[PDB]
């Protein structure tokens, strides 16, 4: 009968190689970092622009005004809103979370994370969640580099002695306060309830294939998250503790 | 008079044998595993495809991305989403819990449970609830084979020495954490409250008539839950205790 | 003047006989037991079926799966759901509480109560509220015949020494637990609050004109609630006490 | 100057006679008892019917099934609903509280109150609020004649020693329980809060000019509320006390 | 343009012309001059005794409220015919509309020297009866004060703080009036209800239509004060009981 | 590959100067004070009116009756409402928070803040929150601070952190003002109400219309600061009571 067909699957092949190949091909992917790095350089250069300057502007714009380019234009200076109007036109910018071939301010920050991680140190007080606010929650001075969701793309979870998990918990402390500020609906809700709202896309970002373990290592050292002896920074271990 | 006809039913036969035969035939049955095993083969072979490879893919897809094929396509790689688009077209896939003659990713997992129970061992960390997360709750290394609701179709409750009840309690430990991850609304709610949400469909799955007690015995022995002498594993007894 | 006309109604006839005749003709009903016994016989015999076998099946089906025939089909065996599909087609079955000329599984149980009262004794553990569960609440073994709302149509409240009232209180003990199981919204509610939710339709059922006091007496004796000397069973008097 | 015009109204006439004449002409009414007694007689006699029999039916129907003729038809016997369909057609019956020239079951009971006050004594247990329920609240046996809002049209507030106020308080005890039963929204709310919901239409009904003080006295005596020497019943005074 | 805005530092800010603007722009509500004018204008144009019509509109407002369209449906055919004519001529509306719109409450407010007289003859036909008000105060409450429009007669700047005592005396009625108008405030505390009408009553007492001298004449006319500016004994008792 | 391009951004310039220049150019505004000062003068002079008198009237009107010109007309004197009808017609006045080229009573008070700050001293008792009410909560509270438009005069980058003390002093009024404007926040906690106006006030204080030197002169003229940058005693008390 058909029960025999289903039971016959006990002797059917289950190759860990081809299964993990399928897992990677089927896994959660909000957007392709390779595609938007490509679409930025191609669209920006075709419109004869310093696309490298535009990404720095789009990252500054994202960090301080959000991911709604059309909305932020109305409540901005005439000179500033003229730049934003040009950035929307050239890079075909959109709001929220659209398709894989669509560029958003949040995505530019995510794919070009080696610059966004630098920019965070100079405009920490102009952020939705200010640096001083974040310093009060953590106790010790919270790492400015971690003060944006795009930091997740730098986290290497497979780091020896479970260092990557401690970093993910440290960054989660910010993510909770960030979510409460972005959507005030979650301001009264419990800490673990808010943690589950960003758990899936952050995990997908940390498990990213764009930057290698070695690239992530160099980036994590560069912004002082880990010392030369691969040991974590004292503020990062405090933020992971306060996360619970 | 019609009152006489209704009263005449006092002398009408009420055979406990034929009534219990009707009770069993009218009982609650989640889906027809025979029909979906049939429709996968029929639809798959008609579109000249390796339907046996397709079920493996559909199971991998269900274990790692869920039961909404249309929704998971939008947040996936172009190569991956192209495979999913083909699987929806051939197998006429749908979402949630529709009619008996409708195929869903969760149903393919459930009916072809002898394969999915093997696949779970290689992609335990790619699951919504990771294996290492499940190991922390249980204390001892939690059985990977049990880390999906479809495992219920392998459970034989009528096992001697009440072994089937111990297995159902062991699988329930996962089901609680799985439900909290699927719907984050139940993350703050009490353990016994979450247990009642999946109690009825799991019981209906365990009381299934597709696989016989002998087939279930072979499957439970194969995956390593019980030995040939029908003795539960060191971890399956720990998981059932931590369940309370 | 019109004051005269209205005042003239003081000497106008108000015969308690013709008023109670109107009260009975105008009273709340929901459905006509004579009409549904007629329609089952007429529809069943027209479609050349053993309609007497069908009513037993419809009763078994109602007791164990409810009053939604379309819904219960989807979560049932292919053989079982094929029988239900045939029963819906011939008897033009519907859900909930429709018109007086519409047949429902609950109505078949209500009008053919002399057979349903027998069926309850053999499938007591397959009921939404099991017999053993009912035995725990009552203390003494609860009468299986009373374990369905349709039992109300057999209750004669005008029984000497107020025996009928004791039966209505005994049946109410089940009705409370039955309501809490049917709608879990009433689970946390107080006992007297749940009692008022079914008080009106049960009273209307108990005041029914289909079965005469003599027919009700025969029915109540037939299922061991009372004996020829109108002495009601000890379990029935215990259930009425526990009802408070 | 316009301030002079307004100030000139200090010397303008304020005749208590013509003001009370206006108060009576402007006071809250609802419907005209003369008009509905007329329209029942006119519509009834035009359709060649015993309209005097029909009002007794409409009253019985009203007391036991309410004021929604279309709604009560669906949950009634085929013979009964056929009578109601005829009564709606002839008397152009409507629901709730419409215009002055519209007939409703509640208005027929109000208009023809000398006949409804009699009917209440024979169908006290078939009422929405049963007589025995009303006896429990009052302590002493509550007057059956008072167990309907239409009783208000018999109350004479201008009775010596303020007897009319004591009757209005006794009838209010029923009105509270009646309102809670009609609309279950008011069941949990405070006694004085529910009292204000029916205070205005009841006051308008008691202040009625249809029946004279002498007619009201005769009616109040004929249904044992008072005697020839204007001394009220012991149950009415108890009901007025329990009202607070 | 920054120079133009900064030049306003040397620009004139005359306290005289600013306070002249403040008085001209301050919160008025309705214009009593305009509605006295429009009543006299519209009334005389439709060849009516507009002086009789204002007394009718005042009687109508005191006993039936401010919704002319609504009160028509629940009124006598003769009465509702007068109200239909008054709406047509004086273009009457509901609630609180524009400054050039006439409402029953506004007619009572602007022609307060006549409304204050009418209150003495229909005290028992008011929403809050005079006898009810006599029970609360402990002394016979002034009938003239038994309407919110009385506030337009109060002169707060009266020597020895007499106006404040009158305001407190009128507040005792206003509390009971508010509880009757909106039964939502029936259970709420005395000081909580006092704040709901505090702002519009204060605005009414600070009114510019009647001068201190006109207010003195009006307060003298309806026995609140005498020639010597001495306050009535019932008015000082009502102000004391106000703090309850 | 493209991973190399993204990694190359590690050596790409991140100059705090040009970044803060972008931050200022991209920051939240609401309306353009230059544009509304222009539109008032242009529309006012085109209708042959003393537009300088009209702004003082619009400011008085805003301070005492709010930002809904159509609504305040219905509950006003015939002479007063006639002036308001003319002001709406000439200056094309609107309600709430519309576009950058739209004039509102609140915007006239904000852009012409050097006059509104003077007007506040003479009509302090006619304000939604009276001056005497504000004196009770605080020492005599500065009348100049008794309106949200005062924020446009605050210079947060003042030495010894003087600007921050002024922002805390003005916040004491803003809390009581918010509770009066929306009675929904009357029972709510002090820090909860403080967060409702924190974002637009910060955006107003960080404004580029008036320079640090202009702001210094303004705060000096209305006695919050003296020619030696030392704070007024009432301003330091209001900042303390703010917590």
Q: How is this structure best summarized?
A:
The structure is a homohexamer. Helix content of chain A is 60%, strand content 0%.
Give a verbal description of the structure.
The structure is a homohexamer. The first copy, chain A, is mainly alpha-helical and 244 residues long. Chain A has one domain. The first copy, chain A, has 13 helices and no strands. Chain A has helices at residues 2-7, 16-26, 33-46, 51-65, 69-74, 78-91, 105-111, 113-122, 131-138, 163-182, 191-206, 213-222, 234-242. The longest helix of chain A is centred in the C-terminal third of the chain and has 20 residues, at 163-182. Chains A, B, C, D: InterPro entries: Capsid_Phlebovir/Tenuivir, Nucleocapsid_Phlebovirus. Chains A, B, C, D: Keywords: Capsid protein, Helical capsid protein, Host cytoplasm, Host Golgi apparatus, Host nucleus, Ribonucleoprotein, RNA-binding, Viral nucleoprotein, Virion.
Q: Secondary-structure element order of chain A, as H and E?
A: HHHHHHHHHHHHH
Topology, number of strands of chain A: 0
Please state the oligomeric state of the protein chains shown: homohexamer
Gross geometry of chain A: globular
Largest sheet of chain A: none
Estimated share of beta-strand residues of chain A? under 5%
Helix content of chain A: 55-70%
Number of domains of chain A: 1
Derived structural class of chain A: mainly alpha
Whole-angstrom Rg of chain A: 20 Å
PDB class: viral protein
Keywords: nucleocapsid protein, N protein, ribonucleoprotein, viral nucleoprotein, RNA binding, virus, RNP, viral protein
Assembly: hexameric
Entry title: Crystal Structure of Toscana Virus Nucleocapsid Protein Hexamer
């Amino acid at each position: 009968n058909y029960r025999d067909i289903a039971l016959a699957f006990l002797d059917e092949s289950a190759d860990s190689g081809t299964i993990n190949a399928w897992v990677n091909e089927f896994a959660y992917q909000g957007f392709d970092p390779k595609r938007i790095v490509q679409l930025v350089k191609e669209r920006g250069t075709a419109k004869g622009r310093d696309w490298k300057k535009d990404v720095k502007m789009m990252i500054v714009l994202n960090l301080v005004r959000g991911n709604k380019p059309e909305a932020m234009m109305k409540k901005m200076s005439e000179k500033g809103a003229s730049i934003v109007a040009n950035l929307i036109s050239v890079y075909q910018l959109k709001e929220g979370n659209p398709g894989r071939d669509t560029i958003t301010l949040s995505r530019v920050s995510a794919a070009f994370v080696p610059w966004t991680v630098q920019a965070l140190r100079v405009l920490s007080e102009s952020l939705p969640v200010s640096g001083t606010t974040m310093d009060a929650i953590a106790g010790v001075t919270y790492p400015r580099a971690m003060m944006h969701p795009s930091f997740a793309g730098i986290i290497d979870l497979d780091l020896p002695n479970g260092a990557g998990a401690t970093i993910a918990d440290a960054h989660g402390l910010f993510m909770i306060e960030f979510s409460k500020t972005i959507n005030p609906s979650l301001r009264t809700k419990q800490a673990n309830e808010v943690a589950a709202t960003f758990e899936k896309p952050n995990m997908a970002a940390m498990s990213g294939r764009f930057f290698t373990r070695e690239d992530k290592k160099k980036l994590l050292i560069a912004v002082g998250i880990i010392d030369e002896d691969l040991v974590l920074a004292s503020a990062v271990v405090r933020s992971a503790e306060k996360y619970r």
